[PDB]
Design a protein around this ligand. Structure first.
Ligand SMILES: [Cl-]
Length: 124
């Protein structure tokens, strides 16, 4: 039992690089975060900022989540991110992804004590 907070970090944090350099980033990262183990996770964003900067979002602009709950937060500033989306031809277990590097606001849901990100809702 990974905590929700730990799951968020595994799925979404990539503080080791400033930006995706190559079009193969998503293929590489989705595999190495074990997001293609049982199925190809269809959509996933990686954030290239410090964990502290991402946790800090829980103290920023309170917004509704896509699901209607009101424990989401939008980052005041843009962040370096990489969107990963499975291509239409991708088939498990040969998962393939489209990599898009971007600078966008992130929206995360926060929960707990400490009050930390547990879900990535969207980028703007
Ligand atoms: Cl989950």
């Amino acid at each position: 039992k990974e905590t929700a907070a730990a799951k968020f970090e595994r799925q979404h944090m990539d503080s080791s690089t400033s930006a995706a350099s190559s079009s193969n980033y998503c293929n590489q990262m989705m595999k190495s975060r074990n997001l293609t183990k049982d199925r190809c996770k269809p959509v996933n964003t990686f954030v290239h900022e410090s964990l502290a900067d991402v946790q800090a979002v829980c103290s920023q602009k309170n917004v509704a989540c896509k699901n209607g709950q009101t424990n989401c937060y939008q980052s005041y500033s843009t962040m370096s991110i990489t969107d990963c989306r499975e291509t239409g031809s991708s088939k498990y277990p040969n998962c393939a992804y489209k990599t898009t590097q971007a600078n966008k606001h992130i929206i995360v849901a926060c929960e707990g004590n400490p009050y930390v990100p547990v879900h990535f809702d969207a980028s703007v």
